[PDB]
Amino acid sequence: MKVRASVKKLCRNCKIVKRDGVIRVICSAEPKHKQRQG
Template identity: 70%
Template sequence: MRTLVAGFTLQSKKGITMKVRASVKKMCDKCKVIHRRGVVRVICENAKHKQRQG
């Protein structure tokens, strides 16, 4: 699933979707901003809060 709109979602082979944004921010207290392989990501218990900068 890919939508070519600002803040589109990206679906990996595992079927997990993630928001792709120019600016990633914490959405709740449980969100964590991490850096993996030069990419800034937000991970959270709430799947709707998952983001990747790009």
């Protein structure tokens, strides 16, 4: 889980979802590509 100020899609499997008022990035193939904005 990366906590940074700019979250992005790092491959073609990443998905940007807004959960509870926080922009997150969910990846189905690479658990390294997990990000939240903070």
